[PDB]
């Protein structure tokens, strides 16, 4: 029944409170999502100062309920099934040869708006590493987000790696260890193993004079085989 909430365009609000090596910051975001296309469009602004980490490192932290699940995979969409009461999404993110983020978020409907509220804490970053040295290019790659059921927690375990392009031509890897658990007592869908295929585009708004990020994302689920009846259907 949660998926019925996503048949059209849904407004989104994102609120992040962060602390990285003691640098405190907050981010606010707004836009909309259209799960029929797996599409998200959002604008984020840094409320206080220049963001103390590079914008691309926050993309994953800043609503996988907007992924497009093809028809034959609808029974494996945990994210929508938990709505409207929502889910808790927690991550540890390990930046290779650098620090880590730990995040806890609640994703739920607040009226007709899908809201992602996050607390982020980062530690052990190197003052002249790629993160605190702001050596990441302002762009974003395509990824595979691997999802498995976690029966003990009535939720999911999610693991993937992000590749951040570095201005010297190298790559900064960020390994993501994620878990999601429903907030409500209602039944959820616990999926077979599968993955999301992602693509994100980062851009800027010349009229926005605050430090900011404009994001366009498309995400489709995959990794569950079509049955022969579906493959050969007329
Ligand atoms: As992979 C990727 C990056 C930019 C535009 C399209 C796809
Ligand atoms: Ca910069």
Curated annotation (Swiss-Prot):
The keyword Magnesium does not apply. Keywords: Chromophore, Luminescence, Photoprotein. Changing residue 100 to T: In EBFP1.2; shifts the excitation and emission spectra to shorter wavelengths and increases quantum yields compared to BFP. SUPFAM superfamilies: GFP-like. The keyword tRNA-binding does not apply. One of its GO terms (biological process) is generation of precursor metabolites and energy. Changing residue 157 to Q: In R10-3; matures to the red-emitting state with excitation and emission maxima at 555 and 585 nm, respectively. Green fluorescent protein has been engineered to produce a vast number of variously colored mutants, fusion proteins, and biosensors. Further generation of mutants led to more stable proteins (at 37 degrees Celsius for example) with brighter fluorescence and longer fluorescence lifetimes. Changing residue 64 to L: In RSGFP4; increases fluorescence and shifts the major exitation peak to 489-490 nm. Changing residue 188 to A: In mut1.5; shifts fluorescence lifetime from 3.03 to 2.72 ns. Changing residue 74 to R: In Topaz; shifts the major emission and exitation peak up to 20 nm. Pfam families: GFP. Changing residue 198 to I: Suppresses the 475 nm excitation peak, leaving only the shorter wavelength peak at 399 nm. In H9; increases fluorescence at 395 nm excitation. Changing residue 162 to V: In P9; increases fluorescence at 475 nm excitation. In R10-3; matures to the red-emitting state with excitation and emission maxima at 555 and 585 nm, respectively. Monomer. Energy-transfer acceptor. Its role is to transduce the blue chemiluminescence of the protein aequorin into green fluorescent light by energy transfer. Fluoresces in vivo upon receiving energy from the Ca(2+)-activated photoprotein aequorin. Belongs to the GFP family. This is Green fluorescent protein. It comes from Aequorea victoria. The gene is GFP.
């Amino acid at each position: 029944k949660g998926e019925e909430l996503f048949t059209g365009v849904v407004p989104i609000l994102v609120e992040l409170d962060g602390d990285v090596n003691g640098h405190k910051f907050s981010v606010s975001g707004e836009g909309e999502g259209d799960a029929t296309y797996g599409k998200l469009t959002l604008k984020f602004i840094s409320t206080t100062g220049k963001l103390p980490v590079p914008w691309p490192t926050l993309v994953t932290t800043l609503v996988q309920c907007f992924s497009r699940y093809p028809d034959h995979m609808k029974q494996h969409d945990f994210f929508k099934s938990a709505m409207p009461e929502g889910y808790v999404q927690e991550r540890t993110i390990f930046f290779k040869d650098d620090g880590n983020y730990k995040t806890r978020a609640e994703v739920k409907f607040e009226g007709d708006t899908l809201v992602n509220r996050i607390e982020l804490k980062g530690i052990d970053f190197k003052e002249d590493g790629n993160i605190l040295g702001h050596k990441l290019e302002y762009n974003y790659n395509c990824h595979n987000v691997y999802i498995m059921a976690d029966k003990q927690k009535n939720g999911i375990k999610v693991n993937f790696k992000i590749r951040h392009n570095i201005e010297d031509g190298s790559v900064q890897l960020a390994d993501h260890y994620q878990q999601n658990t429903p907030i409500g007592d209602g039944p959820v869908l616990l999926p077979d193993n599968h993955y999301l295929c992602t693509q994100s585009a980062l851009s800027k708004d010349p009229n926005e004079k605050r430090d900011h990020m404009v994001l366009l994302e498309f995400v489709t689920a995959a990794g569950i085989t079509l049955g022969m009846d579906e493959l050969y259907k007329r």
